Chain length 141, copies 6
């Protein structure tokens, strides 16, 4: 069973969604990011860029998603003491909401953050005891 | 910004298991198991999205190396208040595959959300109970 | 080149394409009992076909990107093979036959990929497996 | 739903040849030969699309492995009642390449269809004669 | 990092024409004119790649908006010292298409380079002659 | 017509360095250095795009083989009248990496342009000054 629902009938209205996500990182890792000492690059900016691209890639990643003419995409990342918080904002005038884009942007930005600081988060067994992406959800539609 | 040189590294067994969880309403869950979801077979569609995602990891994550995957499995099991996704990836390369397992899980969870969007939204078009709880690398 | 649709009107575009893949009876039997190793053939194939519809412009050089409003891939099991019928809809300046054809083709390819080991003969060849005839069976007139 | 483990498979020469056919009106084949098709060089464009599609196979087919393709060729011949496409793909890896050759051919045929849509449609905008027939993996 | 809001902008006929050029050895030009390059029909393959590239712009340029293109054309002219590429894109949207026309031209130039790689390399495996130059929006 | 067979080729170290340049107006360059560009951090965004681009080469260039890249780095330096992009790609495979390096550089430059469009345009919406000047392979390992 599979299908992309018919939205021909629905009306073209302003669509907005704000999604929030959090990735738990080690205190030393946060310091490295803050002082921009991560060899792979500027963590925050790289993740934002990855998050913005992801928003546009949503339909090819999510099967039943409609291709949508996005009008605005913003990914904000705030550094906290226990990790990083990602907030993505998406908007367009279409006949089907944009939460999936906002949710995809956030998810990828969080993944990208993880990829950027892998060597600092892994322990002597090459594992992640502390690293964890927790609570990705929709703030408001 | 850069993809670090792995030239001087040995080709070894690379394996990774990731687990993720999405909180859903009980009514939504019941419909998922009774396969009464309008958009289709939720768990299978999500496994597929997750497996495809494992392969798209390098185009989604900037500093990730394009790698030769040998095995990819995404398992999803229904629980009383949500679905649990477990992704497993394996390869023989000079750089691990946890990003692939992490991406496969995130997209599978994203797909589960998409497939039940209308059953989870309240009368304000808001999602007060839905959320992707905890994606983490179980073992590498 | 990608033909200019600038001065074309925004209208309802819909197309239905059907295709067929010849499979062994034992394969057909595996698909029904949900005993195919790589997974649920029908659903995986439908999912791939739906995604392929959106991928059309990326695969076919002169195709325009299109705001698809509806995409459905139906897969019916027959004793000698699987039948795929894809339906695409959109209100735009250019029809959607190509999207329906691509969706169906990729669905058929996916079914094949899923049951490859049951279709192969002792020499590793495919003397019975065959994608027979993809066709546009109908589409709104423009 | 999963990408089967090929970790312990042998690394050996993998080759696949696929043949496909698209039935077209003669007035169409006429324009193809004369290269009077508005959208462009039908044959070369379809071949290019086919080569590209060979590489996009794993992105399109869920359970396919990303493989290091070493050779891809799409041959298209003009016949009186249609065009025949033959795609060949080679590699030295631990899993076959029939899917790559099947996809290259499938997309090469679709591109041909796209290029001559205008000429194949009948008075009611239907495609009563156009058809993609028999895509198969060839022996030897 | 952000895709600027364009919801309040006017929908209008958007067009963009980009010109680009690649210097090649005269011996390479000859092989293209005669259709004697191993990899294939340089002009048609580069044009096909450029057209596809126009559609991929939003996927390659981070802050680019996904735009419903209505027309894409890639002209490639053979000159005595190289090949000139001219791409034209058109749409009716809330934001221009210069980036689509620019991307089409660049990828077509890159494809040309790829097609004739072996013919351009000198004895040290270098490309002292080959060069993509002056990609710009004209008019 | 096709992607030539590289089977008989040897698996060796492949590396290329490409240099590219985009001409920008002085006021645009000032905003870049002051981080006053509305779209974001021009340098990092362009670098990230160039690196991703390196990986998409086979998808963009028809006769390119898919390659297991081992190193991709994009350098971007601000100059008086424009930005200089230098991409370095490396692999150990049967096909060099000049195309990956050229593509990374090209996309990085396109990204710079996209980022400062608003500052380059004139009152007509044209770009009389903006120009991607000269993308080229400045060096690459010799292969036999």
């Amino acid at each position: 069973e599979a299908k992309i629902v018919d939205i021909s009938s629905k009306d073209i209205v302003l669509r907005e969604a704000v999604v929030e996500g959090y990735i738990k990182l080690r205190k030393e890792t946060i310091e490295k990011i803050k002082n921009k000492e991560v060899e792979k690059g500027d963590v925050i900016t790289v993740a934002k860029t990855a998050g913005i691209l992801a928003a546009k890639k949503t339909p090819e990643l999510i099967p039943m998603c409609h291709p949508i003419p996005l009008e605005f995409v913003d990914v904000e990342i705030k550094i906290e003491e226990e990790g990083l918080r990602v907030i993505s904002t998406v908007k367009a005038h279409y006949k089907t909401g944009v939460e999936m884009e906002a949710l995809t942007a956030t998810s990828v930005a969080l993944l990208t953050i993880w990829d950027m600081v892998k060597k600092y988060e892994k322990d002597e067994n090459g594992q992640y005891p502390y690293t964890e992406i927790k609570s990705i959800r929709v703030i408001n539609k």
